[PDB]
Amino acid sequence: TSENITQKVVWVEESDKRSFLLDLLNATKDSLTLVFVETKKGADSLEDFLYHEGYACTSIHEEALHQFRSGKSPILVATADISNVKHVINFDLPSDIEEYVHRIGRTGRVGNLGLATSFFNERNINITKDLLDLLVEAKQEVPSWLENMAY
Numbered sequence: 001t002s003e004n005i006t007q008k009v010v011w012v013e014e015s016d017k018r019s020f021l022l023d024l025l026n027a028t029k030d031s032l033t034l035v036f037v038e039t040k041k042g043a044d045s046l047e048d049f050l051y052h053e054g055y056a057c058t059s060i061h062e063e064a065l066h067q068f069r070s071g072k073s074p075i076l077v078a079t080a081d082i083s084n085v086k087h088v089i090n091f092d093l094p095s096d097i098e099e100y101v102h103r104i105g106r107t108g109r110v111g112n113l114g115l116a117t118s119f120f121n122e123r124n125i126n127i128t129k130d131l132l133d134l135l136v137e138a139k140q141e142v143p144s145w146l147e148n149m150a151y
Contacts, residue, residue: 005104005114007140009131012119017091018049024089024117025055031071032085036078036103038092043077046091050075084109090118097130125149 012020025033037043043061050057057075058064065081067073076082080094088107094100100118108114120131132150135142 002101002104002134002138003140004112005108005116005138007104007135007138008115008117009120009135009141009143009146010117011121011143011145013121014123017119018046020119021089021091022053025075028115028117029074029086031074032068033075033087033089034068034078034082034085034106035075035089035091036080036094038079038094040079042092043079047077050077082106084114086115088114088116090116093118093120093124093127093131095126097127097134100127100131100134120146 010020021035035046037046040061043059047057047059055075056073057077058067058073059077061079064073064076068076068082080099083106085107088104090100090103094103104114104116107116124131128146129150132142132146135146
């Protein structure tokens with residue numbers, strides 16, 4: 001159970017995810033930001049977007065992993081060897097809660113709190129109730145919208 005990972009689930013429309021990611025990145029870490037996306041093409045295109053924004057980043061979908069650790073590339077974009085990152089960003093959420101749990105486990109260590117931010121929209125209605133129940137048992141912030149969509 002994930003009480004020691006602060007989880008912020010926010011509503012982001014698909015067309016808003018990229019500028020919301022830039023505001024979030026600025027808002028939040030000098031390194032070890034891990035951003036999960038749904039597809040290989042998505043990983044690829046997001047890395048390029050970030051590049052043209054001026055953010056040093058890599059993607060995986062050894063070099064890449066070796067840049068992440070050194071903090072030469074503060075951002076690693078990955079699809080579906082990595083733990084104790086400073087921030088996990090679920091740019092796309094997965095279709096089941098177990099996979100959510102696996103991904104958020106990559107932030108935090110014993111004696112410290114992790115941080116995981118997840119973007120959610122109508123595409124994610126399938127995981128609504130499971131995410132709600134997980135947030136409640138982990139005593140995390142639950143957005144009014146999530147509660148009302150689960151019902």
